[PDB]
With several copies, the nearest count.
Chain A
Amino acid sequence: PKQIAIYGKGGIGKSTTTSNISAALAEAGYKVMQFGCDPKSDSTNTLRGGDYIPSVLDLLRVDAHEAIFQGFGGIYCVEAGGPAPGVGCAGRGIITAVELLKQQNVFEELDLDYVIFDVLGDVVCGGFAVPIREGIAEHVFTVSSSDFMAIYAANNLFKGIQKYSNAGGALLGGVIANSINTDFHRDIIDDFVARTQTQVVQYVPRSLTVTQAELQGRTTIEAAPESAQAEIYRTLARSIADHTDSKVPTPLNAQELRDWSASWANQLI
Chain B
Amino acid sequence: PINLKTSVVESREQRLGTIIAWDGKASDLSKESPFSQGSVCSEQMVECQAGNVRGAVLVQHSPIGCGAGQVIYNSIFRNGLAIRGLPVENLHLISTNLRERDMVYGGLDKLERTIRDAWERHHPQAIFIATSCPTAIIGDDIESVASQLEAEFGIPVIPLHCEGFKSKHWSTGFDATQHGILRQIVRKNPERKQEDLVNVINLWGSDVFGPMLGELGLRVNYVVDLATVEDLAQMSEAAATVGFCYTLSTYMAAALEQEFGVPEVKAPMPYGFAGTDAWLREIARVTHREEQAEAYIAREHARVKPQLEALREKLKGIKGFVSTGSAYAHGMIQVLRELGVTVDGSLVFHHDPVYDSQDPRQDSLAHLVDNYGDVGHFSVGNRQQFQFYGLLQRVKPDFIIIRHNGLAPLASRLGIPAIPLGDEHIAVGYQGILNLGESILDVLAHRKFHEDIAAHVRLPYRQDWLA
Chain A residues within 8 Å of B, Cβ to Cβ: 57, 60-62, 82-83, 87-93, 95-96, 99, 102-103, 105, 125-127, 129-130, 133-134, 167-169
Quick one: given A61-B17, A89-B138, A103-B3, are A96 and B144 in contact (CB under 8 Å)? Answer: no
9-residue interface stretch from B100-108, B244-252, B427-435: B100-108
Q: How far is the CA of A125 from the CA of B138 in the complex (A)?
A: 6
Quick one: given A61-B13, A169-B144, are A126 and B104 in contact (CB under 8 Å)? Answer: no
Quick one: given A87-B106, A88-B104, A99-B8, are A127 and B139 in contact (CB under 8 Å)? Answer: yes
30 residue pairs bridging A and B, Cβ less than 8 Å apart: A60-B104, A61-B14, A61-B17, A62-B14, A82-B105, A87-B105, A88-B103, A88-B104, A89-B103, A89-B104, A89-B137, A91-B137, A91-B138, A92-B100, A95-B136, A96-B100, A96-B104, A99-B8, A102-B6, A103-B3, A103-B10, A105-B5, A125-B138, A126-B106, A127-B139, A129-B139, A130-B139, A134-B141, A134-B143, A167-B144
Say if the beta carbon of B140 comes within 8 Å of chain A: yes
Say if the beta carbon of B147 comes within 8 Å of chain A: yes
Shortest CB-to-CB span from B175 to chain A, Å, is 13
For A168, list chain B residues within 8 Å (CB): 144, 147-148
The answer to whether B137 touches A88 (Cβ under 8 A) is: no
Majority-rule SS of A interface residues: loop
**Nearest-CB residue, chain A, relative to B138:** A89
**Nearest-CB residue, chain A, relative to B147:** A168
For B102, list chain A residues within 8 Å (CB): 88
The answer to whether B137 touches A92 (Cβ under 8 A) is: yes
Shortest CB-to-CB span from B5 to chain A, Å, is 8
Residues of chain B in range 1-15 having any CB-CB distance to chain A below 8 Å: 3, 5-6, 8, 10, 13-14
For B8, list chain A residues within 8 Å (CB): 99, 102-103
The answer to whether B137 touches A105 (Cβ under 8 A) is: no
The answer to whether B144 touches A126 (Cβ under 8 A) is: no
**Nearest-CB residue, chain B, relative to A134:** B144
For A102, list chain B residues within 8 Å (CB): 6, 8
Majority-rule SS of B interface residues: helix
The answer to whether B139 touches A103 (Cβ under 8 A) is: no
Query: Count of chain B residues with Cβ under 8 Å from any Cβ of A?
Result: 26
For B140, list chain A residues within 8 Å (CB): 126
The answer to whether A88 touches B3 (Cβ under 8 A) is: no
For A103, list chain B residues within 8 Å (CB): 3, 6, 8, 10
Q: How far is the CA of A93 from the CA of B144 in the complex (A)?
A: 21
Shortest CB-to-CB span from A132 to chain B, Å, is 10
Q: How far is the CA of A88 from the CA of B3 in the complex (A)?
A: 29
Most A Cβ at <10 Å: residue of B104, B136, B144: B104
Most A Cβ at <10 Å: residue of B3, B17, B103: B103
For A93, list chain B residues within 8 Å (CB): 104
Q: How far is the CA of A90 from the CA of B144 in the complex (A)?
A: 22
Shortest CB-to-CB span from A188 to chain B, Å, is 32
Shortest CB-to-CB span from A214 to chain B, Å, is 29
The answer to whether B141 touches A133 (Cβ under 8 A) is: yes
Most A Cβ at <10 Å: residue of B10, B105, B108, B137: B105
Inter-chain pairs besides A92-B103, A95-B139, A133-B144, 8 sampled, C-beta below 8 Å? A82-B104, A83-B106, A102-B8, A103-B8, A125-B139, A126-B139, A127-B137, A130-B139
Q: How far is the CA of A93 from the CA of B137 in the complex (A)?
A: 9
For B17, list chain A residues within 8 Å (CB): 61
Q: How far is the CA of A82 from the CA of B104 in the complex (A)?
A: 7
Most A Cβ at <10 Å: residue of B3, B6, B141: B141
**Nearest-CB residue, chain B, relative to A99:** B8
The answer to whether A60 touches B101 (Cβ under 8 A) is: yes
Quick one: given A103-B8, A127-B139, A168-B147, are A92 and B104 in contact (CB under 8 Å)? Answer: yes
Residues of chain B in range 116-145 having any CB-CB distance to chain A below 8 Å: 136-141, 143-144
Q: How far is the CA of A266 from the CA of B102 in the complex (A)?
A: 42
The answer to whether B143 touches A60 (Cβ under 8 A) is: no
Shortest CB-to-CB span from A152 to chain B, Å, is 20
For B14, list chain A residues within 8 Å (CB): 61-62
Most B Cβ at <10 Å: residue of A87, A93, A99: A87
For A87, list chain B residues within 8 Å (CB): 105-106, 108, 138
For A130, list chain B residues within 8 Å (CB): 139
The answer to whether B138 touches A60 (Cβ under 8 A) is: no
Question: Which of B10, B136, B138 touches A88 (beta carbons < 8 Å)?
Answer: B138
For A96, list chain B residues within 8 Å (CB): 100, 104
For B139, list chain A residues within 8 Å (CB): 91-92, 95, 125-127, 129-130
Q: How far is the CA of A66 from the CA of B102 in the complex (A)?
A: 22
Q: How far is the CA of A3 from the CA of B141 in the complex (A)?
A: 19
The 3 closest A-B pairs by CB, nearest first: A126-B139, A87-B106, A88-B106
Residues of chain B in range 132-167 having any CB-CB distance to chain A below 8 Å: 136-141, 143-144, 147-148
Q: How far is the CA of A168 from the CA of B104 in the complex (A)?
A: 23
Quick one: given A62-B14, A103-B3, A103-B6, are A127 and B104 in contact (CB under 8 Å)? Answer: no
Q: How far is the CA of A90 from the CA of B138 in the complex (A)?
A: 9
Q: How far is the CA of A103 from the CA of B10 in the complex (A)?
A: 8
Question: Which of B13, B100, B104, B141 touches A83 (beta carbons < 8 Å)?
Answer: B104
Shortest CB-to-CB span from B421 to chain A, Å, is 32
Residues of chain B in range 88-112 having any CB-CB distance to chain A below 8 Å: 100-106, 108
Shortest CB-to-CB span from A62 to chain B, Å, is 7
Q: How far is the CA of A62 from the CA of B100 in the complex (A)?
A: 13
Q: How far is the CA of A125 from the CA of B410 in the complex (A)?
A: 40
Shortest CB-to-CB span from A230 to chain B, Å, is 37
Shortest CB-to-CB span from B382 to chain A, Å, is 18
**Nearest-CB residue, chain B, relative to A133:** B141
**Nearest-CB residue, chain B, relative to A132:** B141
The answer to whether B105 touches A83 (Cβ under 8 A) is: yes
Q: How far is the CA of A90 from the CA of B104 in the complex (A)?
A: 6
